[PDB]
């Protein structure tokens, strides 16, 4: 064939830290469908937002919003435990159906997005150009959010390890962990990946007794 219908830009959802996670890649022939499992960002999270985006940028905010919906009634559980299946299905007429279903509760929500939605030919071309021109910057942003989430994972696992130990962890150790946790908290608000990792390192260097418990 010399011609066919494609979806012209990547389609995905916003994930923790403001990154766009792609479900359908740009130039995929239509009709198409793809599903991926997602989980919750925080402990005890009973609801998630499914924000549908079109574009090639790593920052969710730089892509075109197509719509959004909430999925509630998730049983409060530790982060990463819920299994939320997100499905993108584009029919032959370019109509996009997005659904999210929580495996444990069976709760499901969906949205229909018209074929005329999103970016026009000129905006599609500008999207592709802007993504290529910002390839390195977008990669650095993705690496920063990965470290910010990891830094928050180290902050989460440390604080949980402190509470379980309680009286067992010495004073000199606990107070120095607390000060290293705040230095990590402050660096996480910044955009310097190495600064965050150095604060994580400084935390680990004062958590030696905490790890043994």
């Amino acid at each position: 064939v010399l011609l066919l219908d494609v979806t012209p830009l990547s389609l995905g959802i916003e994930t923790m830290g403001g990154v766009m996670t792609t479900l359908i890649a740009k130039n995929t022939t239509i009709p198409t469908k793809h599903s991926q499992v997602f989980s919750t960002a925080e402990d005890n999270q009973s609801a998630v937002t499914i924000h549908v985006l079109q574009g090639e940028r790593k920052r969710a905010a730089d892509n075109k919003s197509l719509g959004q919906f909430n999925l509630d009634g998730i049983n409060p559980a530790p982060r990463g435990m819920p299994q939320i299946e997100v499905t993108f299905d584009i029919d032959a007429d370019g109509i996009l159906h997005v659904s999210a279903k929580d495996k444990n509760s069976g709760k499901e929500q969906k949205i229909t997005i018209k074929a005329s939605s999103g970016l026009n030919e000129d905006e599609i071309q500008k999207m592709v150009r802007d993504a290529e021109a910002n390839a390195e910057a977008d990669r650095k942003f993705e690496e920063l959010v990965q470290t910010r989430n990891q830094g928050d994972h180290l902050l989460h696992s440390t604080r949980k390890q402190v509470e379980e130990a309680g009286d067992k962890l010495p004073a000199d150790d606990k107070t120095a962990i607390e000060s290293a946790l705040t230095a990590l908290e402050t660096a996480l608000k910044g955009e310097d990946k190495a600064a965050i990792e150095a604060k994580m390192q400084e935390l680990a260097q004062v958590s030696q007794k905490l790890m043994e418990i």
Partner: peptide
């Protein structure tokens, strides 16, 4: 690892 989602507004 499955990617993670934020809670509504």
């Amino acid at each position: 690892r499955p990617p993670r989602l934020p809670r509504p507004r």
